[PDB]
Design an enzyme around this catalytic site. Sequence first.
Site, PDB file in Angstrom:
ATOM      1  N   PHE B 117       0.835  -1.201   0.000  1.00 20.58           N
ATOM      2  CA  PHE B 117       0.000   0.000   0.000  1.00 20.58           C
ATOM      3  C   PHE B 117       0.872   1.253   0.000  1.00 20.58           C
ATOM      4  CE2 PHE B 117      -4.562  -0.667   0.449  1.00 20.58           C
ATOM      5  CZ  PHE B 117      -4.637  -2.028   0.614  1.00 20.58           C
ATOM      6  N   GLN B 231      -6.474  15.059   1.878  1.00 23.27           N
ATOM      7  CA  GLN B 231      -6.216  13.940   0.995  1.00 23.27           C
ATOM      8  C   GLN B 231      -7.496  13.384   0.391  1.00 23.27           C
ATOM      9  OE1 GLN B 231      -2.720  11.279   1.573  1.00 23.27           O
ATOM     10  NE2 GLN B 231      -4.316   9.724   1.934  1.00 23.27           N
ATOM     11  N   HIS B 233      -9.069  10.323  -1.763  1.00 23.66           N
ATOM     12  CA  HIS B 233      -8.886   8.971  -2.270  1.00 23.66           C
ATOM     13  C   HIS B 233      -9.488   8.934  -3.669  1.00 23.66           C
ATOM     14  CE1 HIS B 233      -8.257   4.611  -1.797  1.00 23.66           C
ATOM     15  NE2 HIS B 233      -9.284   4.523  -2.624  1.00 23.66           N
ATOM     16  N   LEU B 243     -15.760   4.707   0.254  1.00 26.27           N
ATOM     17  CA  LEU B 243     -14.456   4.228  -0.207  1.00 26.27           C
ATOM     18  C   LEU B 243     -14.504   2.849  -0.876  1.00 26.27           C
ATOM     19  CD1 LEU B 243     -11.320   4.382  -0.305  1.00 26.27           C
ATOM     20  CD2 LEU B 243     -11.244   3.605   2.022  1.00 26.27           C
ATOM     21  N   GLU B 246      -7.961   0.596  -2.407  1.00 29.60           N
ATOM     22  CA  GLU B 246      -6.880   0.396  -3.382  1.00 29.60           C
ATOM     23  C   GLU B 246      -6.676  -1.092  -3.707  1.00 29.60           C
ATOM     24  OE1 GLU B 246      -2.157   0.786  -2.886  1.00 29.60           O
ATOM     25  OE2 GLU B 246      -3.099   2.757  -3.090  1.00 29.60           O
ATOM     26  N   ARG B 288      -0.992   8.269  -6.263  1.00 28.06           N
ATOM     27  CA  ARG B 288      -2.326   8.727  -5.861  1.00 28.06           C
ATOM     28  C   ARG B 288      -2.733  10.077  -6.456  1.00 28.06           C
ATOM     29  NH1 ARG B 288      -3.357   8.143  -0.499  1.00 28.06           N
ATOM     30  NH2 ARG B 288      -1.642   9.638  -0.125  1.00 28.06           N
ATOM     31  N   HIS B 356     -10.971  12.386   2.007  1.00 26.25           N
ATOM     32  CA  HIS B 356     -10.607  11.166   2.714  1.00 26.25           C
ATOM     33  C   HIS B 356      -9.949  11.421   4.069  1.00 26.25           C
ATOM     34  CE1 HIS B 356      -9.811   7.013   3.308  1.00 26.25           C
ATOM     35  NE2 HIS B 356      -8.521   7.073   3.044  1.00 26.25           N
ATOM     36  N   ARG B 391      -0.054  11.971   3.325  1.00 29.83           N
ATOM     37  CA  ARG B 391       0.119  10.772   4.165  1.00 29.83           C
ATOM     38  C   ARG B 391       0.366   9.557   3.289  1.00 29.83           C
ATOM     39  NH1 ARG B 391      -3.874   6.272   5.638  1.00 29.83           N
ATOM     40  NH2 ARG B 391      -5.012   7.173   3.868  1.00 29.83           N
TER      41      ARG B 391
HETATM   42  C1  LIG Z   1     -12.937   4.379   4.714  1.00 23.94           C
HETATM   43  C2  LIG Z   1     -11.559   4.550   5.312  1.00 23.94           C
HETATM   44  C3  LIG Z   1     -10.570   3.592   5.196  1.00 23.94           C
HETATM   45  C4  LIG Z   1      -9.322   3.803   5.764  1.00 23.94           C
HETATM   46  N1  LIG Z   1      -8.397   2.835   5.624  1.00 23.94           N
HETATM   47  C5  LIG Z   1      -7.175   2.994   6.160  1.00 23.94           C
HETATM   48  C6  LIG Z   1      -6.137   1.954   6.031  1.00 23.94           C
HETATM   49  O1  LIG Z   1      -6.401   0.912   5.405  1.00 23.94           O
HETATM   50  N2  LIG Z   1      -4.935   2.168   6.582  1.00 23.94           N
HETATM   51  C7  LIG Z   1      -4.656   3.303   7.249  1.00 23.94           C
HETATM   52  O2  LIG Z   1      -3.530   3.457   7.755  1.00 23.94           O
HETATM   53  N3  LIG Z   1      -5.554   4.295   7.410  1.00 23.94           N
HETATM   54  C8  LIG Z   1      -6.798   4.210   6.903  1.00 23.94           C
HETATM   55  N4  LIG Z   1      -7.733   5.243   7.069  1.00 23.94           N
HETATM   56  C9  LIG Z   1      -7.336   6.414   7.857  1.00 23.94           C
HETATM   57  C10 LIG Z   1      -7.410   5.999   9.336  1.00 23.94           C
HETATM   58  O3  LIG Z   1      -8.203   4.823   9.505  1.00 23.94           O
HETATM   59  C11 LIG Z   1      -8.013   7.057  10.236  1.00 23.94           C
HETATM   60  O4  LIG Z   1      -7.322   8.271   9.985  1.00 23.94           O
HETATM   61  C12 LIG Z   1      -7.853   6.680  11.703  1.00 23.94           C
HETATM   62  O5  LIG Z   1      -8.441   5.390  11.950  1.00 23.94           O
HETATM   63  C13 LIG Z   1      -8.475   7.703  12.652  1.00 23.94           C
HETATM   64  O6  LIG Z   1      -8.379   7.242  14.002  1.00 23.94           O
HETATM   65  P1  LIG Z   1      -8.385   8.238  15.259  1.00 23.94           P
HETATM   66  O7  LIG Z   1      -8.269   7.436  16.522  1.00 23.94           O
HETATM   67  O8  LIG Z   1      -7.414   9.360  14.997  1.00 23.94           O
HETATM   68  O9  LIG Z   1      -9.846   8.931  15.232  1.00 23.94           O
HETATM   69  P2  LIG Z   1     -11.243   8.156  15.073  1.00 23.94           P
HETATM   70  O10 LIG Z   1     -11.033   6.688  14.833  1.00 23.94           O
HETATM   71  O11 LIG Z   1     -12.064   8.950  14.097  1.00 23.94           O
HETATM   72  O12 LIG Z   1     -11.920   8.276  16.516  1.00 23.94           O
HETATM   73  C14 LIG Z   1     -12.258   9.560  17.033  1.00 23.94           C
HETATM   74  C15 LIG Z   1     -12.979   9.406  18.368  1.00 23.94           C
HETATM   75  O13 LIG Z   1     -13.212  10.684  18.949  1.00 23.94           O
HETATM   76  C16 LIG Z   1     -14.553  10.772  19.422  1.00 23.94           C
HETATM   77  N5  LIG Z   1     -14.998  12.181  19.420  1.00 23.94           N
HETATM   78  C17 LIG Z   1     -14.887  13.081  18.428  1.00 23.94           C
HETATM   79  N6  LIG Z   1     -15.386  14.288  18.822  1.00 23.94           N
HETATM   80  C18 LIG Z   1     -15.811  14.155  20.090  1.00 23.94           C
HETATM   81  C19 LIG Z   1     -16.445  15.009  21.116  1.00 23.94           C
HETATM   82  N7  LIG Z   1     -16.741  16.302  20.879  1.00 23.94           N
HETATM   83  N8  LIG Z   1     -16.729  14.464  22.313  1.00 23.94           N
HETATM   84  C20 LIG Z   1     -16.455  13.175  22.592  1.00 23.94           C
HETATM   85  N9  LIG Z   1     -15.882  12.348  21.706  1.00 23.94           N
HETATM   86  C21 LIG Z   1     -15.545  12.769  20.470  1.00 23.94           C
HETATM   87  C22 LIG Z   1     -15.345   9.847  18.536  1.00 23.94           C
HETATM   88  O14 LIG Z   1     -16.521   9.395  19.214  1.00 23.94           O
HETATM   89  C23 LIG Z   1     -14.342   8.741  18.261  1.00 23.94           C
HETATM   90  O15 LIG Z   1     -14.436   7.720  19.259  1.00 23.94           O
HETATM   91  C24 LIG Z   1      -9.021   5.064   6.513  1.00 23.94           C
HETATM   92  C25 LIG Z   1     -10.013   6.018   6.629  1.00 23.94           C
HETATM   93  C26 LIG Z   1     -11.247   5.780   6.057  1.00 23.94           C
HETATM   94  C27 LIG Z   1     -12.310   6.806   6.147  1.00 23.94           C
END
Ligand SMILES: Cc1cc2nc3c(=O)[nH]c(=O)nc-3n(C[C@H](O)[C@H](O)[C@H](O)COP(=O)(O)OP(=O)(O)OC[C@H]3O[C@@H](n4cnc5c(N)ncnc54)[C@H](O)[C@@H]3O)c2cc1C
Lengths: 130, 577, 119, 243
Positions: B117, B231, B233, B243, B246, B288, B356, B391
């Site tokens: 990837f 970014q 996708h 989504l 890839e 990309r 994305h 990224r």
């Molecule tokens: C469809 C898709 C596929 C992807 N695939 C990949 C992949 O294959 N490989 C890769 O490396 N990356 C991938 N990404 C990117 C990556 O998965 C995400 O950037 C990452 O998982 C985000 O995780 P996080 O913990 O930063 O935030 P999140 O997982 O978004 O979690 C945020 C948390 O904060 C909480 N929150 C937000 N605001 C508040 C508030 N005001 N009060 C209380 N709680 C709040 C939410 O409830 C949630 O629990 C993908 C993204 C998408 C959309």
Amino acid sequence: TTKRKPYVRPMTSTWWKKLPFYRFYMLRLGTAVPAVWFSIELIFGLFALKNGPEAWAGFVDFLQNPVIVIINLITLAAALLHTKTWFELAPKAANIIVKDEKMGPEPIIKSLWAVTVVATIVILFVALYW
Amino acid sequence: MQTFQADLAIVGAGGAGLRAAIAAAQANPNAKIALISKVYPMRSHTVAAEGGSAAVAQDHDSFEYHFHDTVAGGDWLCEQDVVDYFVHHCPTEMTQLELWGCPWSRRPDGSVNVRRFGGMKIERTWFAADKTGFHMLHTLFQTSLQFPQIQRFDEHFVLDILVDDGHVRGLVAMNMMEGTLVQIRANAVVMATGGAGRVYRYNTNGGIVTGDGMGMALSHGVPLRDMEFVQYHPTGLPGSGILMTEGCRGEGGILVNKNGYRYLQDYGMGPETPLGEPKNKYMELGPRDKVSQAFWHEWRKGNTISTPRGDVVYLDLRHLGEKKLHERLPFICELAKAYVGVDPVKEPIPVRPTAHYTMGGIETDQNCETRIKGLFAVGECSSVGLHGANRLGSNSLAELVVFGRLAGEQATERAATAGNGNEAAIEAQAAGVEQRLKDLVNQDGGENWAKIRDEMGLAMEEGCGIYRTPELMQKTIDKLAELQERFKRVRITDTSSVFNTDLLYTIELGHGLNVAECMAHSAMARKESRGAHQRLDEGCTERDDVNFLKHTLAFRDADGTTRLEYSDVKITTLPPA
Amino acid sequence: MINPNPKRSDEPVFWGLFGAGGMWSAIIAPVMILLVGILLPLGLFPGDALSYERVLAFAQSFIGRVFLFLMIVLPLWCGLHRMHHAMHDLKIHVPAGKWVFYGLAAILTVVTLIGVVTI
Amino acid sequence: AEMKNLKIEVVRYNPEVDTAPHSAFYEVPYDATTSLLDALGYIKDNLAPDLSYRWSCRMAICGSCGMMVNNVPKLACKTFLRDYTDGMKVEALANFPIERDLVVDMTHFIESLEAIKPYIIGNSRTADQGTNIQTPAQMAKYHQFSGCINCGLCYAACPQFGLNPEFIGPAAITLAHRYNEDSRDHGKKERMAQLNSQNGVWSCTFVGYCSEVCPKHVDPAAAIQQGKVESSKDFLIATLKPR
Ligand SMILES: Cc1cc2nc3c(=O)[nH]c(=O)nc-3n(C[C@H](O)[C@H](O)[C@H](O)COP(=O)(O)OP(=O)(O)OC[C@H]3O[C@@H](n4cnc5c(N)ncnc54)[C@H](O)[C@@H]3O)c2cc1C
Ligand code: SF4
Ligand code: F3S
Ligand code: FES
């Protein structure tokens, strides 16, 4: 104090009437009644057998009432339904892996039916032919 | 307000937030940790990832290769001391996830498998079928249940943070089911709230990805870093923006226009490779940016197919066959059938570029700490300096567990050595939150929040997309300024206290507007083209390390204006040119 | 909130019997219902195959004693088990449900045992 | 063209004001692509701003969607209006208390899930030693049962749960089974007390409708029966230990 008032929907005794999936479940449980009724019939036939030719003849007359016949015809239909449904469900108890993949349930179902088919033939042969 | 005590508070229960929570529970077994999330943890957006998580593993690999791919792919806006830290800690964390039970796909010998990837040369992406994010998150969530140090506050929406004398002292949150406010006191606070992709009309993101955390930090003078780099996708379903991974093109899928032509060969990604043999860097596995841009060029020539949901190209997967499809792409087939009425076996899937990932975010140092002492940020909501201007595919999930750990441990230390702050000043800050909320409820003017939202999304799509111009970026800047005025005239007609989402969605939109303005202002000022930021105006179409080898910092002052400062990029062993 | 130290249920015992019962009656009940229920009374059998004499010979034979025992008993433990849960699901409240049905099964089992060792 | 309209019946409830839930009716425009989730959004945007519901992913992977559509438990994001032109009635997820509109109390679900210790136990290995070894064959043992998105549709489906709210339930048991069958895990004994409980696997009468409505094809019904077999073994061994 909370401003919440959680509303709890009641579940009636007619819950099973609504959805055909629940209806076929109830009908499956239904098969028990004839099955038990048949086991009872056999006890009567068993004790009529030990009391001699006289009692056995009265048992055989009972069996040709012929309201009993219709009840037994129903009993047979129930038993076959129980069989069909039983073989669909037993496979789910087995967690068998073949070549890195979880098997089933068709290979098991077929086998059970093959045994039923043979058993029926073996028994019918033994009972009648001689 | 009912007041709770905690050593540290964690805002958000995605990958990063949970890893942080688990880490802090292990760093201090006597700690009291408050894990806060507006949804139940497993609904967090990390659940939707299907590609995989990067970690060096094959004998012929090196941490220098992973370091190099990241820095180059980040177009040299990466903090190289952070990238080095990152690559060296991925194997530890991917392996640890495995130890916690994560069902990583396996080789026959029973070792974890890996695949390619993010354009990488040597494959290093670990993958749990095509549900890697689902498995990573559920593993992490479920693991956290054994640590009684972690008191979860499920479905609590955090409103603001409590800061005094340059030090964080807690936060205020609403109990969503009750409708009541709650103070949580803690001398360390970790923001792990995900990105801000829902400021765009079409995106791959879950409804909850609204930029709340980024907004809260803005309010307290913390700048948001590199927000212009958003970014896209290249293959998402039209309308929904959902989504299509890839993996589809990894397993030999192709991209074609209305004439059935594999256009990518004409845009520098030639020559055409045969159906069976896709090659990295070529055609549908090209860069990309070049792929997302190719769509745009094809749209100009009138070569895109027209549909009710929008102009699209076709992702053709017929030539793959069942075995390959249902072993490595089954979920994609369900998605296609359900959301666009297309069976990939018998038909081509319509797609187009889709917003994305939010590269930018809350400014942090190498320990995930902000300019406010004790206030940390981690994951997509942050900018640790890993991703620079683009990224790398599959570095986001790894970031969550690598820096989630760090932040968890780091925050444990600040708490321990914090010392007490001014009690009256803090309670005054809490009252400040409660009051600002009442002002929004008592607000009126009959503007519909949903329409402001709709229009924000359209403005970001038009102004801050794949190709950017000063005309349209200004149009978007002005449009947002307009909507910020309208926001003050919004009226929230639902005054109920039991799970009142009308209020909550309106608050989210508020943050989104603040963040959107940082995106647009940052883009407009960046007079060069770098990574995901691409401009068409004379003298801005190229990379410029003389004048723009620097991070954008977007502050938001009390007067409601968005100001920019610039900062330098740490180099170690890999200078540009 | 949820019981940390729950009592182990005795259900496995009855379920086991229910399991053997269902399997036996699935394979072997249909043919037996056909023989005793239909063929015998309608007289659809060749010669003296199902006459009083040949039945008694079989019944009294050791194999027959064991066969008739299981044929009667195993379906009861399966059937009465199902009725026990039909009551629950219909919300018909039966006092000491556990003891009634499984007691009935115990009783009948014993009566059948007496039968196959003759009266 | 002109978008066709559909009349949708949504069962509203506001505990501050209503004494019991009550139906409301909304005309929503739709085409072949329109989901119940789309429609709920349209309503809130344009017809009733006070319509509360759970959702996030939009692609049937997070599980917050859960709700009843014409007495069938479904996910809103995987339910499409084209299929309900004869009428559509939307209620809160069944067998859970209704807090507000389509939002139900999921607490018992979460507590049941927590109770069965869904995490690796009794494995001393550390990360410096590398990962465990686990073959495709060994993974095939639990893999399907690891696909649960915790949507709770199986709880709305199970009448036994309807009749007995202490039943820990299909998804909860399934997760216990998922770790019990993981070669890396050594905490099977730590989970049986719950499974062996009357409120454990033995509340299940194998109606099998949980597997029917499961959007991610986990087959929790199969996990329970395998659980019943495993509980039975545990019963036998327990009888034979006079220790
Ligand atoms: C469809 C898709 C596929 C992807 N695939 C990949 C992949 O294959 N490989 C890769 O490396 N990356 C991938 N990404 C990117 C990556 O998965 C995400 O950037 C990452 O998982 C985000 O995780 P996080 O913990 O930063 O935030 P999140 O997982 O978004 O979690 C945020 C948390 O904060 C909480 N929150 C937000 N605001 C508040 C508030 N005001 N009060 C209380 N709680 C709040 C939410 O409830 C949630 O629990 C993908 C993204 C998408 C959309
Ligand atoms: S089992 Fe299937 S249905 Fe029951 S929760 Fe997990 S996913 Fe939702
Ligand atoms: S719906 Fe209910 S009783 Fe058993 S098999 Fe499924 S749980
Ligand atoms: S919204 Fe995520 S499951 Fe339907």
